[PDB]
Design a protein around this nucleic acid. Structure first.
Lengths: 1364, 130
RNA sequence: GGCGCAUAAAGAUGAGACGCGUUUUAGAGCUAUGCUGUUUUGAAAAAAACAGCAUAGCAAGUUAAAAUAAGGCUAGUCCGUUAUCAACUUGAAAAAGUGGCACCGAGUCGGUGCUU
């Protein structure tokens, strides 16, 4: 028999549904394998699969970069030890052998205790002579005397392990060192970016004012006192506050809605910077770059301050002075505590655990926690000056190694290393001719493009070699190849396009991509002058004239500038309004003006023959970052250049890419024209279409030419098939699992291929309550309603703007306090009898938006047709509707919808756009999973080359299945069970097949496949109701789901009867039998036994918790290295178990060591997993077990089903964890009542529907005292948690007289007592009771185990009672 | 941005959305405490009542076993001068193998503390992350 | 599902440098009192601490070295947290193969018929 398959796709879950023609899902007897007694099972053939969310792969990249940075650092130490390897055996032999042994206990250490200087006495003289290493190197830089060799070594091994940042480039100079030139640079870029109402700081000079010794949160007021500017929250001032660590906002500043926090100290600066930058536009972007640059400069002036004896030690001689202001200003504070407070001295300095000075060094604290703790104590003290003024400026009791010395340019370290080798070169022979090598291994920043220096054993590296020996930074140039590695670089991390593969996408601001974006916006802009009487868009030559006459002038151009520099100048057009471009252009020709400034030539950038030259200069700028390789690739174009731009053009960077390559834009041409995408989008003619509409087109050749090459050549592997998709890795894991369960699911149903397979996915409900989203733009419209109307409605009743989530008052206040039907007013408190109507009825669309819904008093005010309302209602309000469109209260679309008295009503193109507006499904993941699942099961051939399309792929939205769910009382709420995955998929089959069986002809737009161009403009009748299932048109009512309606209903009261048992309109076959549909559908959604399975996994991941903890006598610690026994050195605890093993063995129990028989679980961590599977029996003998039966070693991963008495299912997450497995057979009337009662004001349908649900809940109040005892016997069978259950029964008894809506919401929160997974603690009315975790794993050992298959249909049951 | 860093930042973002918004200078906590944290709780007082659960571990039923052991109790400050205390927590992986010790038992000071904590409801948004 | 100006965005993957943080050891702790061995004109004693412990008061208090997932072989200035996975029968691995169909019903699936 024929059958059909339906698929819900998600992150956590995937639902598989198998229906016949008659919609009764099958039910088959399957075979059981193993040694149990139930030799046959009888299972339904419908189910879901849920599983852990597919995690991304960013944490692994982070850990890999950390591992390689540590290995590079240790080998820099290895090189510098090897350069002293001769002459350090001259001084003291085992010295490097003791710096390697600086970590173990003195007892098993095989040398003396003191690392440096050997003995006891010289070490103490070293500490009380040199207090710290910064004092050490600040001494021996200015030291004519000869130093000790190991002393210079330990000054230098500290020197190369802490190197700073390479974010600055070149060497330091006062154009980049001090804040003077940088502040001049930022005021220059601000003055250049606005070029209007500017600010100039030539008088006031922040080279010392901004560099002063004060508080930053007072220093910005100092600077705004010096330079007037705008305000303390002005944009210049907010950017200066961004330059000093403060976090301003810009919503009062940009004239934008949302706030904008920015700081440099967070890890997520760039991900929020581009997030705000996409909201505001890119025209500010480089300015913020200078802001960060300026910020780093002042942090430079935070660390190095002494400029008097600043020669040869700018870093180390500075903060030793900070050590001095730490030392005496410690003693002062002690000399201020005991004199006035003898108590709270033992809890400050002998404390160790309470955020005091004892915890600030010897324990866990920070600068800021300690400052907050000594704020109330030291602020209370009577005589304490020069401490509060030092506390607000963050410079008291402050260590050397901050979290804010991550702003050290490495040239400071390199300069003092240069000095530290100059002042020793006169003495030592070996050191005189290796200073080049030492400075080289300091400054060696291994570049981006040269990759991991591998020798082919990589998985990630690509660099090639011009020789074969050991790579050193001594000789990095003449070993690795530059140009070949760069050529392998650019083609590897290029990004192919999903719109056209095998091509390198263009950069984010190429000239061609900019022309693409400006000609994708300007092909949908319309102008109105006096005389056309209907709005019209531009022509091609007008587009050429405006891009040659306004875009080349200014970066951003407003519509005012457009109409006053183009229509007035050469067009002589005066009374013009423009509807298309709103106020400004979000697309900008930024790099056009940039490179115009760089080259200072107007002919060259405007000449159309240098296009690949300019775009690959931009490409090599945006791809490479270091200063060396960036220049010789410009030496290819050194002929045109003038040797002054070399220090200018190599400065600008870019980041990020565009969307599409060059071979898709200026590439393929039309078969009947010979023009490209760009060629039409500047020269098209009158039909001013769009680019995405050109993708949305069917008749043109370009979309077909796209899907020519969207398939690959030879068919790849399925992992290689999913390898070039998009989205999260979670949905990729879901797609691979759904292909696996389809390809296994064909196997179980007689190995016949299916007929109709259905797919969809939907997720991501994270709107965050929408409380400020209305008052930002939508409700904010009435704030510019004051700009036009003047009626301050809130002036008579100030009503809050965060509880507008109720739709009736929302649509009232979005209606000017008026009606769009008759000239009247409304009562705010009597809105219950006032009725919500629709601009288009429920027999043409389905939407619940402000574009659709309006609010009024009487339905007779609308009109007496299913079409648009009457001509007087639009023409008597044609004045005011221009105001509330002009005040942006409603959108353009619904205003154009009511004014269809000009256009007659429902036009043929209009009803075509509605009939296919629902079914254009334009999410790329749907089309790609359609392609993947098409190419697997549909491959047989015939006498010609074309494909026998055996199995029809089909793709429906969630809107149709949500509507079939809602209107026919088939409700669901997610928190009851996890059946609402699987049942959801079932409806996706039904609305699937009953649309294709009823519409055979119009499947040619949402099957993936080559079909005809047969449109819908001649498929809907332009007249009255045609013949029932005998006419030429497909339908008349533009809502597709009127087919499922038993009896339609519109606002005219025309209760029109579509026939009872519907039959398809051209072939005569019943598709949808009313007497045997909803009985069958309500029976199948009320079925108790659905196969949901949690699939097994082996827990890959970390060895243990990533926090090594101090020593203790507990033996369950995991060592750091091999010989570091954790009863002395401590370390890792709580290992992650990958999979347990069931082992039968014997133990050496008793004093006589007698081998008693045992059968137990044993956890296996990932630490010895490979050590397990290389030889299991030897490792198990090493664990302390004998008589290992190798056949009986039962592998048992995470999430494995155990079944035992009375159907109790428990599933095993670790060695000492269990999770509840069973679920509820909760029938259809209970779930329908719980959703309908728990949303007593949350349905928004009909007032008759409102009285029906009200009388329904008031007559079916009898349900909440049978749900409770169902849960009682259920949880008494499958949970056996008696105490909390009796607690919640009494707590239910205590709220018996509670109202209905709150009690229904609390009972659906009560349902999470009995889901799957780990048990949780739930918010009840008041009595939040404790979760009850299972750890007693003894009962698992004598139960039955189910190794189930992937869909849960196939299975095998193994037994553990007789397992011996 | 680790697997728990940016979701910690949206955690304190929706904390600032629940109450007075003027937050400033989130605490730079290390990765070692963030990548092994099960629940981020927010509250008003520095003394955090920790939760509890029962079991069925070979008899000893209807006793109280604490689960969420504190490993980091830092604070964040808002504008102006209102102190909220962040708490990171770890689930206790206690098995059925001990000498009836180091499995965390009741010691009913925390029981009375949880009674006062539930009665006063000083707990703010407590959500799971990893 | 929010398709939200009716569009539909773009998505993941990979290279480099930090700066932290954590943990042991090294930075001879001092004074006074009370417990543990020995010395001594000696009979255990008479008592000197050289060392160890506890209890009170004082002194400083910042910095280093090592490691930063156990380690592995392919010995590299490489690699080890993601995608990959039910059993069973083959196969080193890859990959392949391993399960009867209707009907009446429904408390996690049951019952009946026909049949290799």
């Amino acid at each position: 028999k024929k059958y059909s398959i339906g698929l819900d796709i998600g992150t956590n879950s995937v639902g598989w549904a198998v229906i016949t023609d008659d919609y009764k899902v099958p039910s088959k007897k399957f075979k059981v394998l193993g040694n149990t007694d139930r030799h046959s099972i009888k299972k339904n053939l419908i189910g879901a699969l849920l599983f852990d969310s597919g995690e991304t792969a960013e944490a692994t990249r982070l850990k890999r970069t950390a591992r390689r940075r540590y290995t590079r650092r240790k080998n820099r130490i290895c090189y510098l030890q090897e350069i002293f390897s001769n002459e350090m055996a001259k001084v003291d032999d085992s010295f490097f052998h003791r710096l390697e042994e600086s970590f173990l206990v003195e007892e098993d250490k095989k040398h003396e205790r003191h690392p440096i200087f050997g003995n006891i006495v010289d070490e103490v003289a070293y500490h009380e002579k040199y207090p710290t290493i910064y004092h050490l190197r600040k001494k021996l830089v200015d030291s004519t005397d000869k130093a000790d060799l190991r002393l210079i070594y330990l000054a230098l091994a500290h020197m190369i392990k802490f190197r700073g940042h390479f974010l600055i480039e070149g060497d330091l100079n006062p154009d980049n060192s001090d804040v003077d030139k940088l502040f001049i640079q930022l005021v220059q870029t601000y003055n250049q970016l606005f070029e209007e109402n500017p600010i100039n700081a030539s008088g006031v000079d922040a080279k010392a004012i901004l560099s002063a010794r004060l508080s930053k949160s007072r220093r910005l007021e100092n600077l705004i006192a010096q330079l007037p500017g705008e305000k303390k929250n002005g944009l210049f001032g907010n950017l200066i506050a961004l330059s000093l660590g403060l976090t301003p906002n810009f919503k009062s500043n940009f004239d934008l809605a949302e706030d904008a926090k920015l700081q440099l100290s967070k890890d997520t600066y760039d991900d929020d910077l581009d997030n705000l930058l996409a909201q505001i536009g890119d025209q500010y972007a480089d300015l913020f770059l200078a802001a960060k640059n300026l910020s780093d400069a002042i942090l430079l002036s935070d660390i190095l301050r002494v400029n008097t004896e600043i020669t040869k030690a700018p870093l180390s001689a500075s903060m030793i002075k900070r050590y001095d202001e730490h030392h005496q200003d410690l003693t002062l504070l002690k000399a201020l505590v005991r004199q006035q407070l003898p108590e709270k001295y033992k809890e400050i300095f002998f404390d160790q655990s309470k955020n005091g000075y004892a915890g600030y060094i010897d324990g866990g604290a920070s600068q800021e926690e300690f400052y907050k703790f000594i704020k109330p104590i030291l602020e209370k003290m009577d005589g304490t000056e020069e401490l509060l003024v030092k506390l607000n400026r963050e410079d008291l009791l402050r260590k050397q190694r901050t979290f804010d010395n991550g702003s050290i340019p490495h040239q400071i370290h390199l300069g003092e290393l240069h000095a530290i080798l100059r002042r020793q070169e006169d003495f030592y022979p070996f050191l005189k001719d290796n200073r080049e090598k030492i400075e080289k291994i300091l400054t060696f920043r291994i570049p981006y493009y040269v990759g991991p220096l591998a020798r082919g054993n990589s998985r990630f590296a690509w660099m090639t070699r011009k020789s074969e020996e050991t790579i050193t930074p001594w000789n990095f140039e003449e070993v690795v190849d530059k140009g070949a590695s760069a050529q392998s670089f650019i083609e590897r991390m290029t990004n192919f396009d999903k719109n056209l593969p095998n091509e390198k996408v263009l950069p984010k601001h190429s000239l061609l991509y900019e022309y693409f974006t400006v000609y994708n916006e300007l092909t949908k802009v319309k102008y109105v002058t006096e005389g056309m009487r209907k709005p019209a868009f531009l022509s091609g030559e007008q587009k050429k004239a405006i891009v040659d006459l306004l875009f080349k002038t200014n970066r951003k151009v407003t519509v005012k500038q457009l109409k006053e520099d183009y229509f007035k100048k050469i067009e002589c057009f005066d009374s013009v309004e423009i509807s298309g471009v709103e106020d400004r252009f979000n697309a900008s020709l930024g790099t056009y003006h940039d490179l115009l400034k760089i080259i200072k030539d107007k002919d060259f950038l405007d000449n159309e023959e240098n296009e690949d030259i300019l775009e690959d200069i931009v490409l090599t700028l945006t791809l490479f970052e270091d200063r060396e390789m960036i220049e010789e690739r410009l030496k290819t174009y050194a002929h045109l250049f003038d040797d002054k731009v070399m220090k200018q053009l190599k400065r600008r960077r870019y980041t990020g890419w565009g969307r599409l390559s060059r071979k898709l834009i200026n590439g393929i041409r039309d078969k009947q024209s010979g023009k490209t995408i760009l060629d039409f989008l500047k020269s098209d003619g009158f039909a001013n279409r769009n680019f995405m509409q050109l993708i949305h087109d069917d008749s043109l050749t370009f979309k077909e030419d796209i899907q020519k090459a969207q398939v690959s050549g030879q068919g790849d592997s399925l992992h290689e098939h999913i390898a070039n998709l998009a989205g999260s890795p979670a949905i990729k894991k879901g797609i691979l699992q759904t292909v696996k369960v389809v390809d296994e699911l064909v196997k179980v149903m007689g190995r016949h291929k299916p007929e109709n397979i259905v797919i969809e996915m939907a997720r991501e409900n994270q709107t965050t309550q929408k409380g400020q989203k209305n008052s930002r733009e939508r409700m904010k419209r009435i704030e510019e309603g004051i700009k036009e109307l003047g009626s301050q409605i809130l002036k008579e009743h100030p009503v809050e703007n965060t509880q507008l989530q109720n739709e009736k008052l929302y649509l009232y206040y979005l209606q000017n306090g008026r009606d769009m039907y008759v000239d009247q007013e409304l009562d705010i408190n009597r809105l219950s009898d006032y009725d919500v109507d629709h601009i288009v009825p429920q027999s043409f669309l389905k939407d619940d938006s402000i574009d659709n819904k309006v609010l009024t008093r009487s339905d007779k005010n609308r009109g007496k047709s299913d079409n648009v309302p009457s001509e007087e209602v639009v023409k008597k309000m044609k004045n005011y509707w221009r105001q509330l469109l002009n005040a942006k209260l409603i959108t353009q679309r619904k205003f154009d919808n009511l004014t269809k008295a000009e256009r007659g009503g429902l036009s043929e193109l209009d009803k075509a756009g509605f009939i296919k507006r629902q079914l254009v499904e334009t999410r790329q993941i749907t089309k790609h999973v359609a392609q993947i699942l098409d190419s697997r099961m549909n491959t047989k051939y015939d006498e010609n080359d074309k494909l026998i399309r055996e199995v029809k792929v089909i793709t429906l939205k969630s809107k149709l299945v949500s509507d079939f769910r809602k209107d026919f009382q088939f409700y669901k709420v997610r928190e009851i069970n996890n059946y609402h995955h699987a049942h959801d998929a079932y409806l996706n089959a039904v609305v699937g097949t009953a649309l294709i069986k009823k519409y055979p002809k119009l499947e040619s737009e949402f099957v993936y496949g080559d079909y005809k161009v047969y449109d819908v403009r001649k498929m809907i009748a332009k007249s009255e109701q045609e013949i029932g299932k005998a006419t030429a048109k497909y339908f008349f009512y533009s809502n597709i789901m009127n087919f499922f309606k038993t009896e339609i209903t519109l606002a005219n009261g025309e209760i029109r009867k579509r026939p009872l048992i519907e039959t398809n309109g051209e072939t005569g076959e019943i598709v949808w039998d009313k007497g045997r549909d909803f009985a069958t559908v309500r029976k199948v959604l009320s079925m108790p036994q659905v196969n949901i399975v949690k699939k097994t996994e082996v827990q890959t991941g970390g060895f243990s918790k990533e926090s090594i903890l101090p020593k203790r006598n507990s033996d369950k610690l995991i060592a750091r290295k091999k010989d570091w026994d954790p009863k002395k050195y401590g370390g890792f605890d709580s290992p992650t178990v990958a999979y347990s093993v069931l082992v039968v063995a014997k133990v050496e129990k008793g004093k006589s060591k007698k081998l008693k028989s045992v059968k137990e679980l044993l956890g296996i961590t990932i630490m010895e997993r490979s050590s397990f599977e290389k030889n299991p029996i030897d490792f198990l003998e090493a664990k302390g077990y004998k008589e290992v039966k190798k056949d009986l070693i039962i592998k048992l991963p995470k999430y494995s089903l155990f079944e035992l008495e009375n159907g109790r299912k428990r599933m095993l997450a670790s060695a000492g964890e269990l999770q509840k497995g069973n679920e509820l057979a909760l029938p259809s009337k209970y779930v329908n009542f719980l959703y309908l009662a728990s949303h007593y004001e949350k349905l928004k349908g009909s007032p008759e529907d409102n009285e029906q649900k009200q009388l329904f809940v008031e007559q079916h109040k009898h349900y909440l005292d049978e749900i409770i005892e169902q849960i009682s016997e259920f949880s008494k069978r499958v949970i056996l948690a008696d105490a909390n259950l009796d607690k919640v029964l009494s707590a239910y008894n205590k709220h018996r007289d509670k109202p209905i809506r709150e009690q229904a919401e609390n009972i659906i929160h009560l349902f999470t007592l009995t889901n799957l997974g780990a048990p949780a603690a739930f918010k009840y009315f008041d009595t939040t009771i404790d979760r009850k975790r299972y750890t007693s794993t003894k009962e698992v050992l004598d139960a039955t185990l189910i190794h189930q298959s992937i869909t849960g249909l196939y299975e095998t049951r193994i037994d553990l009672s007789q397992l011996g | 941005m680790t697997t728990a860093r940016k979701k910690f930042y949206q955690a304190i973002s929706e904390f600032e959305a629940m109450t007075g918004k003027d937050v400033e200078r989130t605490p730079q906590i290390a990765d070692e405490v963030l990548n092994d944290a099960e629940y981020i709780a927010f509250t008003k007082t520095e003394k955090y009542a920790l939760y509890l659960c029962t079991s069925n571990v070979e008899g000893l039923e209807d006793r109280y076993f604490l689960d969420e052991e504190c490993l980091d109790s830092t604070f964040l400050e808002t504008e102006d001068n209102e102190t909220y205390y962040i708490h990171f927590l770890q689930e206790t992986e206690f098995s059925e193998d001990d000498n009836e010790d180091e499995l965390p038992l009741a010691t009913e000071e925390q029981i009375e503390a949880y009674d006062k904590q539930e009665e006063l409801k000083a707990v703010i948004l407590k959500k799971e992350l990893n």
